[PDB]
Amino acid sequence: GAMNSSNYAELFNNDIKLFVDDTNVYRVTVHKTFEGNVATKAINGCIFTLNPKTGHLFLKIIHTSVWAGQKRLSQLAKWKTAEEVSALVRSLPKEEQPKQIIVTRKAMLDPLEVHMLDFPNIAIRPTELRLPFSAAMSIDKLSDVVMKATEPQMVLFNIYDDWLDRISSYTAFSRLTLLLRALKTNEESAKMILLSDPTITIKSYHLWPSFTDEQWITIESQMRDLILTEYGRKYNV
Amino acid sequence: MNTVPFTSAPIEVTIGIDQYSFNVKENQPFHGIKDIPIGHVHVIHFQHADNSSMRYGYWFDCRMGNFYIQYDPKDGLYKMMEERDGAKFENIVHNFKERQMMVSYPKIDEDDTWYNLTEFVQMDKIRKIVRKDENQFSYVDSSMTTVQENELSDPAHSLNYTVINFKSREAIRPGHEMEDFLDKSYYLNTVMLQGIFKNSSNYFGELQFAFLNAMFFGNYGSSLQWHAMIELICSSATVPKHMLDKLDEILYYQIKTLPEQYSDILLNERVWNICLYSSFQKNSLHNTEKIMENKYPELL
C-alpha cells in the first residue's frame, strides 16, 4: 500500500525501487501583461527519479517546448511525468527495472498506474512521508543542467556522491533528506552552511562538498539548527 | 396473457413477480400467478419468511415455454420447472383458474414501468450472462458473484457480465494514456459498443439487467456492473445523441422504481455525483438529474 513510518526501512532493502517526485516538472513565472493582466512564462523543469539505496538519480529534463500549444498544463505534467518514467523503466534492462515505484504525490498514482499497465508486477505506491525532494532544484549543479538545457534530456547523477563508501544507505538518505529539508526551509542559509568554508570544495564529479566524517557531523548539526531556527521564526516559538 | 402455476406453497414466502410482491402464508392455498403480460421478460423471485438470507429468483419469458414452480423440500427452495406437455399445462392451469387459487399480475393500463425497465433486456442475452443452458429460464440469487469479482469462486454459478475496467490495457490505447483515461470514448465506442456489444441496445440490456438483479436480489456485483456501465458513458466525451437520450430515460425509471429505503445500499454516491455534476455528460441527463435531485438529494 502506502509507505510511511512503520515500513521506513524497506527503502534500503535489495528490491529495486524508485521515488518519483513530480513537483518540478511544470514550473512557471507569473508576471503582469502589458494590459495589466497576468500570464505565466514556463521555465525548464525536471523529473526527480531516485534509487534511495544506490543514490542513482535519473534527472529527466523537461524543456518548455513540451508545453507549447498544450492546455491544462498542471494535469498534463502528471501524465508527462508518468510517460517519461514508463519510458525509463522500458529503457532499463529487466534486472534493473524497479519492483516498486513510490510517488511523492497521490495525484501521480493513476497517471503512473495507467502508463505502467504493461508492467503489472511493478507496484505503484504513495507515501505518507513528507519528503523534501522539491528542493532538488536548490542543488546548484542540478539547477544548472536544467536551466541550460535547450532540448529534452536525461542526466544521470549520484545524489550521495561517494558517501556510500563510508556510510550506509539508510544514513545517506537521512543526510540527503536533512540537506534538502534545510534547503527547502531556508535556501540561502543552507547554502551558506554548505559553502562557507572555501577549503572544502565540491569535486567536479560531485554535488556536495568533500566533507570529512567529522565535518559532516558539524554540517548535519548546523542543518538541524537551521531547521529548528526557521521553525521558531515561523511559528514565533 | 400467461400463467406460472405453483404446485403448492409449503413454506411461508414473500413472492416477487417483476416489481410487485405479495406474502404467501405457509401452506396457503396459493397456486400461482395469472395474467402475466406476454412480450416482456419477467422475474419471479422469493424471500423465505423464516430466513430472508438468499433472495433468489428466475428470469423467464413466457414465450419460450410453459413454466411452473414446485418447492423442493430437499434443496429447500421454490424451483422453476418447464412442463413440455402442453395439454397438461392447460388442465393444471385451468383447474386453479376455475378454483381462483391464483394472484393476477396486477398491471395498471397507464403503467409502462416494467416495459421501461426491461425495454432492452432479452432472454437470449440473460442466458449468456447466466450459464445454465439446460433451462430456458435463468436462476439468480443475492450471493452470486460476477466474473470480474472472481478475478479479484465457483465459475458455474457466476454472473458473466461484460468486464469493464478503466485501468486495463483493453481500456487504454498505447500512446493515448491520458486521453483515453480522461475521455473514455475509445473504450465505449470502439471497444465495448462496436467490439463487444455490437450495438447500444445490447449494452443497455445488460445495464438494465444488472440494475434489476441489484434491486431485486441485493446482488452486489450486479450493482457494480450497473454503476460501471453508466460511468463508462458519462465519462465518454463522445456519445451518440440517441444513446444519451435513452440512457436518461433508462436511469429515470430505475431511480423512480428504486425503493426509497434501499437507496443507501444500491446507489454509489461517487459515481452518481461524478456522472450528474462532474462528467462530460453532466448536462445531458435532464430527467435523471431531476428525479435524483428531488428524490435522493441527501446523496448529492
Ligand SMILES: CNS(=O)(=O)c1ccc(OC)c(Br)c1
Ligand atoms: C411433472 N409434471 S406435472 O404434471 O407434475 C406438473 C405439476 C405441476 C404443474 O404446475 C403446478 C404442472 Br404445470 C405440471
